Structure 1
Amino acid sequence: TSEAVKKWVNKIIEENIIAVFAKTECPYCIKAISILKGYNLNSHMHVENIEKNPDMANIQAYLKELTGKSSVPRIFINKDVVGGCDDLVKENDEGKLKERLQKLGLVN
């Protein structure tokens, strides 16, 4: 159950190069996802809405164990912690996001 939730989160992060944990009607989730889709990352992206899930609290606690925060969006790229939307904005603006994606063969 604790194990089940951890395995499920892990599976999301490990099966998808770009993994975003999000919730319903959240501007910073929407913004982050929109930025990532701007790199045409769709084919390698998975967005999980964790608010529509009976185990929301457990998922958030685990995301905090992994990354230091329980808030959404929580963004992983090839298993590495990017963080939230503000972290993504900083990486994108400073060229770090593009470099990440280049190394993954995702942007030419």
Structure 2
Amino acid sequence: SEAVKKWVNKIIEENIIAVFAKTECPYCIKAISILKGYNLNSHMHVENIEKNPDMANIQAYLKELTGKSSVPRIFINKDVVGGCDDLVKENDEGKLKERLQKLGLVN
């Protein structure tokens, strides 16, 4: 489905912070909360891929793009961050704040 790919791509391109998630997902919630802690809301979009008829195609494409089909899947300016553990590593090690500084999202 070129349509599935185009829809996912549009989500990743039109939003600097893009998070694919699902219903009742503790690590989705944690990742999203961490990102909102940097006051990124205005440039963040969260898509619930579970409430979607094409979840399997979406997940397969996210795997093609990032290496894993699990949620959360996190992109920042089209760059793959990965999952919540990846985000936590970047945050703890200073990489996340660096990313956001380069994009003018934090001072």
Whole-Å Cα distance in 2 between the matches of residues 28 and 49 of structure 1? 13
User: In percent, how many aligned pairs have the same letter?
Assistant: 100
Whole-Å Cα distance in 1 between the matches of residues 66 and 34 of structure 2? 21
Q: How many residues align?
A: 107
Structure 1 spans left out of the alignment, 5+ residues: none
1:103 aligns with 2:102: yes
Cα deviation 1:13-56 (Å, max 9, x = unaligned): 00000000000000000000000000000000000000000000
Structure 2 spans left out of the alignment, 5+ residues: none
Shift of 1:75: 0.1
Shift of 1:87: 0.1
Whole-Å Cα distance in 2 between the matches of residues 68 and 17 of structure 1? 20
Whole-Å Cα distance in 2 between the matches of residues 103 and 54 of structure 1? 36
Match of 1:20 in 2: 19
Whole-Å Cα distance in 1 between the matches of residues 53 and 33 of structure 2? 26
Question: Cα RMSD over matched residues?
Answer: 0.2
Shift of 1:68: 0.2
Whole-Å Cα distance in 2 between the matches of residues 39 and 57 of structure 1? 31
Runs of 4+ aligned residues of structure 1 deviating over 3 Å after TM superposition are: none
Whole-Å Cα distance in 2 between the matches of residues 68 and 95 of structure 1? 23
TM-score w.r.t. structure 1 length? 0.99
